[PDB]
């Protein structure tokens, strides 16, 4: 899209660094920074613990630009069909991350911004409504942050 101002992107770098440094001491720049951080850590951990699980999955898929969406939809729908919970939410994220990594390995970088859009929409319409009813983003932070 169109370029923004040098001034806005300097602020964003600054807020990013301070966020990180605050969170290292158990403080947070905001609820968003705290969530971001807890989720990065939850994801590293989930992926470390269940890497064979990922190995099985993202082969069995065979992603291509014309099938990437169908694969995403099938996995995501079965992940949440009988309920949302915080662990399944983490798995959703890790799954989308692996799907993006795999797209770039196979030189289908075009799929990365698409997968982001599909994840963001699904978070907006299905996942955050559950979270709003089940303790909020703060509960996620108290459970997976620190």
């Amino acid at each position: 899209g169109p370029l923004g101002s040098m001034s806005q992107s300097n602020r964003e770098l600054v807020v990013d660094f301070l966020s990180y440094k605050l969170s290292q001491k158990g403080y947070s720049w905001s609820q968003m920074a705290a969530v971001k951080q807890a989720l990065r850590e939850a994801g590293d951990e989930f992926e470390l613990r269940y890497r064979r699980a990922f190995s099985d999955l993202t082969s069995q898929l065979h992603i291509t630009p014309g099938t990437a969406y169908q694969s995403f939809e099938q996995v995501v729908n079965e992940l949440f069909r009988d309920g949302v919970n915080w662990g399944r939410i983490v798995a959703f994220f890790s799954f989308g991350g692996a799907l993006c990594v795999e797209s770039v390995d196979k030189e289908m970088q075009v799929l990365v911004s698409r997968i982001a859009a599909w994840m963001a929409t699904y978070l907006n319409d299905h996942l955050e409504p559950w979270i709003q009813e089940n303790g909020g983003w703060d509960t996620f932070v108290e459970l997976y942050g620190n």
Partner: peptide
């Protein structure tokens, strides 16, 4: 499969 995997191994991770 690698579904009721990513199921059991989300459900293990759930706090």
């Amino acid at each position: 499969x690698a579904x009721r995997x990513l199921x059991k191994x989300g459900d293990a991770f759930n706090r």
